[PDB]
Design a protein around this ligand. Structure first.
Ligand SMILES: Cc1cc2nc3c(=O)[nH]c(=O)nc-3n(C[C@H](O)[C@H](O)[C@H](O)COP(=O)(O)O)c2cc1C
Ligand SMILES: Cc1cc2nc3c(=O)[nH]c(=O)nc-3n(C[C@H](O)[C@H](O)[C@H](O)COP(=O)(O)O)c2cc1C
Ligand SMILES: Cc1cc2nc3c(=O)[nH]c(=O)nc-3n(C[C@H](O)[C@H](O)[C@H](O)COP(=O)(O)O)c2cc1C
Ligand SMILES: Cc1cc2nc3c(=O)[nH]c(=O)nc-3n(C[C@H](O)[C@H](O)[C@H](O)COP(=O)(O)O)c2cc1C
Lengths: 358, 358, 358, 358
């Protein structure tokens, strides 16, 4: 597998163009694994078009200070209200793999989410993180010893939250991967450390009782990731979740489902401040960060655009994408009259009943 | 007429691609007879786009068991909540014609619907069915002796329900067939057995009084097929129908009518459990099966995708399509938190007022 | 000007295809005069797409008789619920001009509307009409003697109604005609008979007072044509109109206005049976005739499709288009459970809030 | 920089075609500076498509007089209800730059808006204006001496209103300019007159307190430009604004915001006659002028179409565009039954919930 290896900063004009650019340097199979989605990708398109359902108003300012994008989540002060989403197998995008992404995320000043299906060992990731904050993403194993194992791993790795991904009991119908007959070219050292001698995908099982078990034994706040329905959010909190991570997995799971942003207000209204909300699935612009905040998210998580940046320039390319989002958000703050992230949470959005074609 | 004859399993990634694939092996006229629809096909497109009006939520599970797709209708236990729709002239798709479809349907474990306009004799179909359950579809004849004849045929053929198709008093404005000057290359042996010596299309007449007559004399439960309006459903039940088959005939009849799925909730609310509902016209994915169930159908009927599978691989190709739907539905069950078909009937759907372009 | 001259019947599969077909035989300038509309034609497209806003239901029959398309308007029994719209300069489409259209309309058995801007003399039209019913369309002249003149002409010509076109005070912004620098190649003998010695387009002025004047002096029922707003319909009736002709002139006048069919229900509700309603602007299918009837029109008027038929086959080609509409409507009647034109007035339409893309 | 220099009248059929025509004579970088907008231009498209959300009705007349497009704003009688929007750097379009635009605007008989970022000196503009009315557009400087300077400039230049642009604290994300690496080829003499010896873009800061300061010290009525939210309109008036200028800067500022016309009714309802409203951002047709008037604007401002006319023909080309709008509006008046600009303010618009695709 001939992944790119060049390390360089990139001039990000917008994140959409990074997809086609990365397609020229990433092997075909791996690129389509990253870029593709379930079915004919209608729900991936819905994730993108949902942002046109609620529109920003330019507005007058009420404060004289320059804008400040910093915020805090679970006690971590971060430079901007976005974190890195947990994504498997960064080596499909770049030879420096998860260590490269971790270096970009740590140097930028936000939180790295580590997929249990990382292609890098934690020691490799730890070198890139250089002490930066990290959260650990897990799937629910049928074998409860494996859950005890991975929770111990997360604690030993300095994780300050667990991300329990609920929406991946089985894979989505990812037509690109089926047609390409795609096969992972490398292993999963973190899960293999624990599975050796005891099928990896088939080891995973979630219900409210599962959430309760993980929350009771992790010693860390647990986000439940993949929530799209408000009653699930309520049930997850009552079962002990310390956070709700609104997501459809980048449209890589259930097909013919809503665009993720369209589900956020109903969830936020039901959560009603009880726990923090992370929002993902389709964030491509600073305007999207702002809209998610205005709609009840505390932070968003970034995914594909960062991986495409990693493909194009390693840690410096991924850093360029994070820098782009921070600068893009700053512009949106100026033009919406917002001085800080809290102001963005208070924005009034214009409801567009016409949708994408207007 | 040089229909395909090869028998093989096929790797179904999605059913949409089967249309173009079948177009390469089926003679032009017959293929466009199968694939085409009335007018400029806007209502066929509406049947397809209607599925984006109600979207599935991924949700947490409440049961530990593996998913089970089986269900029961009119006392028949079937492997999945879909049956074969009655379709004329399977010999346009494959030399093994209705016997090939019947073998796939019986081996899979669901119900075969036999069109009165079959190109195969019942003995030919019976060999494929090998004892499997079958329903018999009829049109209302103007000559009441022909109705007595075909009801006797159905009983002699072991049918356990009659499908009275109401929406075909005359043909739809099927532009493809007119422009191709298409002509059936073979006969209709089942109707000819009774019509000989006594114009076939012109023999057919329906009103509530017709439904009452068929229901009173068939000795079998009667589904009325082609219903799209709730008041017709109520009238049909009051006239003695034992089932409502919501359908627009695959958009092959009335043009500039709604997509069939959009009509289902209003019908289901009016039927209000009185009789079983079969839904068809546009089912292409497991998500569609689930949405129909959640909207009040007891089972769906499959049509064009199975015929395209038959064209590509005979009974094994048709079987591959049925297998695809069963596996696709299983995935949807996992991701919606559903353990069984009854759970699917209880799903909450997201209303998408933006329609297809979102 | 080299207009087609061939006379032949044509096999009409749909009326949309007649446009491109006619473009191959009609001189470029004249063809684009017939086919074009104001601005970028968005409102012509709206006239067409409006039909997808209200959808037909297939439904059970309640009567045993074969369908009958006949109806009556202002005492004239006509073979089907459509008449010929007043259209200028039929010689742009065919050398037999208005006489050819009149022969088709009379032989079919409906009403011919004669534009004051006919290229044929009345004697020429009269030969084609062969005694068939005719209505006379006028514009309001600034010179009231010209109004007295044309009303006398209409009476002498056997007209049984006047069509007062209100929506043409000035021409629409017809980009095709401006860019083609189109110029009428022949004269207007009917208006010239009266204008000689007394600038034709500039002779025309309407207000409720104008309607009152025409209705008081015509000796015939007056339809006011071009109505799109209900308050205008009420004002026109109170001023003495004997009919309301809902129309946007085939989108050839005001741009960025609604599709004509979308305006019909509000007008019909306000008219509330007081006078007959003629509907036009975008009728292309039997389904459109049915929908207009169900929405409050007594008849529709046909325009461009008949002219395209005339271009392709003279009176026999125009006849073929009328025959197509009658047969198309008959099919729609069968499938909607309608035995006669009154049944069509009682149809329940499905409201499609998604519009054209569904 | 090789700007066009030819002076000629042009035959304007519609203003949309002027864009492509100007692209053939304006240098690539400057043309894309004029034509482009933020992001992928979705909000520029929204400005255009918003006009299809409210549709005009053709209607009967209630007055006998010929239409009159004149109106009055802030005591200035103008020939038609549109003015020239403030636009920087007209020299990108034509060598005669702002003097050419000013000559067209003055000769036509409306108000010229002068951007503080003009490429022409005021003396150059004054020659073109030849005494015609002018308003002066400013940005809020951080250095309050610069605000005192520019307000003195405006008064010395005979300005009769100040346009305080609020929506440009920083530049929009104008992808065309970033990708073209566009750089202004000439200077800004008006701002340089005051900035010399005391970074131009970075000199600009607005809040209600800023509006109050400008309104208290200008000696002239102050319009606040860039308003899209009603509460900002109320706050601006309470702070001393004498006018509200509804605008999104031609979509050159905040991305993923509404089309400007969609924001106008809510603003007009809140302003509730307190001060005049100027509307801009997307006006391309006489129908748009009429719709803005009917929705609460007193006049509209024209932008890109006039600059494209200037590129194609200098002052005579810009004049041709103004003449086009006046003639186009006259047609719309005739067909809506409107005799004067006040009648246009009273029009009833058809609400189109289907949007652009209908
Ligand atoms: C290539 C790829 C791999 C992913 N791997 C994981 C994973 O291992 N665990 C997980 O919880 N989510 C995974 N996700 C989902 C992401 O966490 C996140 O929800 C998604 O990337 C957001 O959508 P976006 O990148 O289109 O904005 C993955 C997504 C992609 C595209
Ligand atoms: C080629 C073809 C032949 C059909 N023949 C019949 C028939 O003989 N009797 C009947 O009731 N329906 C017939 N139908 C309608 C089907 O029963 C069913 O309603 C339709 O196939 C469902 O639409 P779909 O296949 O697009 O999902 C036919 C449909 C097709 C496409
Ligand atoms: C070429 C052409 C000429 C027309 N001439 C007249 C006319 O002279 N008088 C009139 O009242 N309407 C005239 N109309 C409008 C028609 O009466 C009618 O409203 C229109 O054709 C209906 O739209 P459709 O043909 O697209 O269905 C004309 C329309 C066309 C296309
Ligand atoms: C090339 C260009 C330059 C502009 N410069 C200014 C400016 O200097 N000051 C300002 O207030 N608005 C400026 N605008 C915004 C215009 O005043 C106006 O709001 C916009 O042109 C209206 O949109 P439209 O031209 O698409 O109809 C500019 C617009 C363009 C296209």
């Amino acid at each position: 597998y001939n992944a790119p290896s060049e390390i360089k900063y990139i001039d990000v004009v917008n994140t959409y163009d990074l997809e086609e650019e990365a397609s020229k340097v990433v092997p075909h199979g791996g690129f389509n694994y990253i870029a593709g989605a379930s079915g004919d990708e209608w729900t991936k398109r819905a994730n993108d078009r949902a942002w046109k359902h609620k529109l920003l108003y330019p507005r007058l300012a009420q404060d004289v200070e320059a804008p400040d994008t910093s915020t805090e989540i679970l006690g971590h002060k971060i430079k901007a209200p976005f974190i890195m989403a947990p994504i498997a197998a960064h080596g499909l995008a770049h030879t420096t793999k998860e260590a490269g992404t971790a270096r970009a995320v740590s140097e930028f000043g936000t939180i790295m989410s580590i997929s249990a299906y990382s292609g890098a060992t934690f020691e490799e990731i730890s070198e890139g993180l250089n002490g930066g904050p990290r959260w650990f993403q897990i799937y629910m194993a049928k074998d409860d010893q494996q859950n005890r194992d991975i929770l111990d791993e997360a604690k030993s790795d300095g994780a300050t939250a667990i991300i329990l991904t609920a929406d991946s009991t089985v894979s989505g119908n990812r037509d690109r991967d089926v047609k390409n007959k795609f096969v992972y070219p490398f292993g999963m050292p973190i899960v293999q450390r624990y599975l050796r001698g005891t099928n990896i995908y088939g080891a995973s099982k979630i219900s409210p009782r599962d959430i309760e078990e993980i929350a009771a034994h992790s010693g860390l706040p647990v986000f439940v990731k993949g929530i799209q329905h408000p009653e699930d959010a309520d049930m997850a909190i009552k079962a002990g979740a310390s956070g709700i991570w609104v997501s459809n997995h980048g449209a890589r799971q259930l097909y013919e489902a809503p665009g993720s942003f369209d589900t956020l207000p109903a969830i936020a209204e039901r959560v009603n401040k009880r726990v923090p909300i992370v929002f993902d699935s389709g964030v491509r612009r600073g305007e999207h960060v702002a809209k998610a905040l205005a709609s009840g998210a505390d932070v968003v998580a970034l995914g594909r655009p960062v991986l495409f940046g990693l493909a194009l320039g390693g840690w410096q390319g991924a850093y360029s994408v994070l820098d782009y989002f921070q600068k893009d958000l700053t512009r949106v703050m100026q033009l919406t009259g917002s001085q800080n992230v809290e102001d963005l949470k208070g924005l009034d959005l214009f409801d567009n009943p016409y949708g994408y074609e207007y």
